[PDB]
Scaffold this active site. Sequence first.
Site, PDB file in Angstrom:
ATOM      1  N   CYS A  47      75.965  33.596  55.245  1.00 55.10           N
ATOM      2  CA  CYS A  47      76.974  34.252  56.064  1.00 55.10           C
ATOM      3  C   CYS A  47      77.667  33.354  57.061  1.00 55.10           C
ATOM      4  O   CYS A  47      77.054  32.938  57.976  1.00 55.10           O
ATOM      5  CB  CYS A  47      76.352  35.400  56.844  1.00 55.10           C
ATOM      6  SG  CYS A  47      75.538  36.608  55.916  1.00 55.10           S
ATOM      7  N   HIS A  99      70.715  34.982  50.436  1.00 58.10           N
ATOM      8  CA  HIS A  99      71.375  36.158  50.935  1.00 58.10           C
ATOM      9  C   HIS A  99      72.618  35.899  51.771  1.00 58.10           C
ATOM     10  O   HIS A  99      72.756  34.907  52.376  1.00 58.10           O
ATOM     11  CB  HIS A  99      70.403  36.983  51.762  1.00 58.10           C
ATOM     12  CG  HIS A  99      70.301  36.555  53.184  1.00 58.10           C
ATOM     13  ND1 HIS A  99      71.193  36.948  54.141  1.00 58.10           N
ATOM     14  CD2 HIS A  99      69.408  35.766  53.807  1.00 58.10           C
ATOM     15  CE1 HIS A  99      70.865  36.406  55.289  1.00 58.10           C
ATOM     16  NE2 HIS A  99      69.779  35.697  55.117  1.00 58.10           N
ATOM     17  N   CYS A 100      73.517  36.844  51.754  1.00 60.83           N
ATOM     18  CA  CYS A 100      74.334  37.157  52.890  1.00 60.83           C
ATOM     19  C   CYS A 100      74.203  38.616  53.185  1.00 60.83           C
ATOM     20  O   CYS A 100      73.268  39.012  53.798  1.00 60.83           O
ATOM     21  CB  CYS A 100      75.806  36.724  52.845  1.00 60.83           C
ATOM     22  SG  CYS A 100      76.647  37.243  54.438  1.00 60.83           S
ATOM     23  N   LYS A 101      75.152  39.396  52.722  1.00 63.52           N
ATOM     24  CA  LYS A 101      75.216  40.797  53.047  1.00 63.52           C
ATOM     25  C   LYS A 101      75.211  41.638  51.800  1.00 63.52           C
ATOM     26  O   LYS A 101      74.297  42.353  51.560  1.00 63.52           O
ATOM     27  CB  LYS A 101      76.477  41.114  53.820  1.00 63.52           C
ATOM     28  CG  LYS A 101      76.352  41.079  55.313  1.00 63.52           C
ATOM     29  CD  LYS A 101      75.414  42.159  55.787  1.00 63.52           C
ATOM     30  CE  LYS A 101      75.461  42.428  57.303  1.00 63.52           C
ATOM     31  NZ  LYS A 101      74.766  43.732  57.637  1.00 63.52           N
TER      32      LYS A 101
END
Length: 304
Positions: A47, A99-101
């Site tokens: 992110c 991961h991000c969102k």
Amino acid sequence: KDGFDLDLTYVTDHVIAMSFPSSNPIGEVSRFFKTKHPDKFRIYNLCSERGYDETKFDNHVYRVMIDDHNVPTLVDLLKFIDDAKVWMTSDPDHVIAIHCKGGKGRTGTLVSSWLLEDGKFDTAKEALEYFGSRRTGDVFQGVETASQIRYVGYFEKIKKNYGGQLPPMKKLKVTGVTITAIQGVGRGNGSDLSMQIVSERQEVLLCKFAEGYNCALQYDATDDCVTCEVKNCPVLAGDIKVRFMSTSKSLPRGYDNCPFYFWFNTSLVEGDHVTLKREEIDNPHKKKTWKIYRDNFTVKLTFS
């Protein structure tokens, strides 16, 4: 079940894709890795917009700054691959979690490149469909945008043709832009359109087609297309994003706050132009827009 309620997927036994650890509450994601992979995990937060307390994960968090609906720099992609390769090969039980969102576009760009680096697939398209099949065979289940697909393809090219390292440097100036199937897009003659070129997060050129602001527009009704001579382009190097904006009410914004856009890297362009088909452009690649962008809709940039 083991007492965890989490959007988390094993893409392989040692590669995990997941959503954002928010405060998936962060205490539970943290408890999960400490319980199922104690001292053997590495987390990658993709992110650009949000970090968190990395001490919940014992400071084993590597950040890659990627904007939502966008791509990492190619440099950053390759650095991620080196970091994950060292981690993954220093202990058979080490795992990486990415991961991000949305668990989808940014995550799938890196997971699919990693699956190429690990040799599980020979081509971007198979690695992409494979990640798509673990989240939900369609490359657009793997990532969100056409540039995301392009950058996994750039990784494949680097691996196959450039020995796993960056290619010789090439620098470019855009001198022209051509858009085919223009009827039905905005005013249907290019007059609502402008084009911004962005390098390292800053605007390096803006063109406004109706006014001749850094350009000159020609509309060819017979051929259903517009050409524009592009003026004053600085020398471009590296990852370049091209965004097209419109004053027209009938032309909606998709991702990135604009009707359509794309990324390319100047060292991976072949020859004196790049031509992108509808499925290769960010926003027209979604089927909800194919009555605006018809099957012969293309954007071509001409270079010196």
